[PDB]
Amino acid sequence: CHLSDMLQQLHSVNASKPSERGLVRQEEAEDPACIPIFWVSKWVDYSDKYGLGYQLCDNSVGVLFNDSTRLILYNDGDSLQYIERDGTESYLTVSSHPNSLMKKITLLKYFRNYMSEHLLKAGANITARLPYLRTWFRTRSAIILHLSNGSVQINFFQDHTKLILCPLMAAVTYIDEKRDFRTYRLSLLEEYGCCKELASRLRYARTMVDKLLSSRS
């Protein structure tokens, strides 16, 4: 998939030593035409029993269950997509679903209710089929989320900073500690450099992408 492209893009920026070569002109790497369409605005890790629930920035929700199936609820509050482990998709609604999906729909509704009532929406200030969560994992320092549109999002726990990587735009959005949201073209970070903080996070991102590539299926 496009993970290989993402890895190549990150190799290229990291190899350019963007924080170690003199005048850094990070602002000139910003490219508003690359702003992502979707990212994860909230998440709930209940994976010891059920799975990982999440909200996308369009107020849709989803769950990646521990059996590797997914349920997606569109922001209309009724339309549902069910995705099997193999990626096979079917459509239904909360109002009309097979009884076999009863338990999973109930769980989705609990996750949805929780993420409607609680937590801050990441990227809240910011305004193409709906992606689903292909896979995820967590380390001690971050949660890594891989969307079916090829995007990879990394949220760092301690300082609340976040990266949204898109291999189609070859771009990274960095959400900093003050929740400022800036989208950069990766090749322009090569061209113009960046601060050591972003540089360090892009090195970490490369390692996370290698982990995704080495743990497929």
Binding site: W43, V44, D45, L119, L120, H160
Partner: peptide, 5 residues
């Protein structure tokens, strides 16, 4: 953490 901010 077990959920987001």
């Amino acid at each position: 953490p077990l959920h987001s901010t």
